[PDB]
Design a protein around this ligand. Structure first.
Ligand SMILES: *[C@@H]1O[C@H](CO)[C@@H](O[C@@H]2O[C@H](CO)[C@@H](O)[C@H](O)[C@H]2NC(C)=O)[C@H](O)[C@H]1NC(C)=O
Ligand code: NAG
Ligand code: CL
Length: 221
């Protein structure tokens, strides 16, 4: 996150850190006891999911819960068009709901968020393209852009400062507006924070998400 503030412990207790050999590469959100929502553009082979984290470099044994990924589900992701950038990760077991691990609720199918709506985005990403990750979670206030600056598959945001928004390591992290996960961080163009940030429009996929959630398992073999 660029242009943000250091989070406090448990300020975003739904947040996931997705790791490859212990290295954070994307975020996500717990959306069900058994499932984390992230971006399809974040996928690799043999990753883990860490919930309840605060400082990436600390063990935090009494706060964290760690999981392997038993299955991944997507709905027509197209990497060329950056379309349908949404992935559900089935965890190896149900997460325990604690003061440091909670579920982030979803919008109903086709719910909208109007231009001008204030949201937040949090994550462990860098402050500049190619810079180091932040060991602590950071967060920034963002505002939904006019539709003409975006595209239907996405919810787009900007900030009033020169640079604020997502960066490397924030892919997959949720956009929270009015208490709901209205977006999944997907991409931005140009320097991090110049704007707009593009998030997958979660509300387009609610019925599909519910299908996954209600039919756990690795799918056809
Ligand atoms: C996110 O926006 C809230 C809403 O403006 C900001 O909270 C305000 O912060 C200003 C300066 O600190 C205060 O003078 C106001 O009284 C605050 N209002 C509340 C509701 O706190 C918040 O600081 C912004 N957060 C970030 C990370 O920018
Ligand atoms: C959501 O909008 C799509 C596209 O217009 C429509 O096909 C679908 O039936 C709507 N879904 C609900 C549940 O209303
Ligand atoms: Cl809703």
């Amino acid at each position: 996150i660029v242009g943000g503030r250091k989070a406090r412990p448990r300020q975003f207790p739904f947040l996931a850190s997705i790791q490859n050999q212990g290295r954070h590469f994307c975020g996500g959100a717990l959306i069900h006891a058994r499932f984390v929502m992230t971006a399809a553009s974040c996928f690799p082979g043999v990753s883990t999911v860490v919930l309840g984290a605060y400082d990436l470099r600390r063990r935090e044994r009494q706060s964290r819960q760690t999981f392997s990924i038993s299955s991944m589900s997507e709905n027509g992701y197209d990497p060329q068009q950056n379309l349908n950038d949404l992935m559900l990760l089935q965890l190896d077991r149900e997460a325990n709901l604690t003061s440091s691990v909670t579920i982030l609720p979803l919008p109903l199918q086709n719910a909208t968020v109007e231009a001008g709506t204030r949201c937040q985005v949090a994550g462990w990403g860098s402050q500049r393209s190619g810079g180091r990750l932040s060991r602590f979670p950071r967060f920034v206030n963002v505002t939904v852009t006019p539709e003409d600056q975006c595209r239907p598959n996405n919810v787009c945001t900007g900030v009033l400062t020169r640079r604020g928004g997502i960066c490397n390591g924030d892919g997959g992290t949720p956009l929270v507006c009015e208490g709901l996960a209205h977006g999944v961080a997907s991409f931005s163009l140009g320097p991090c924070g110049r704007g707009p940030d593009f998030f997958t429009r979660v509300a387009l996929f609610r019925d599909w998400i519910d299908g996954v959630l209600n039919n756990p398992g690795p799918g056809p073999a």
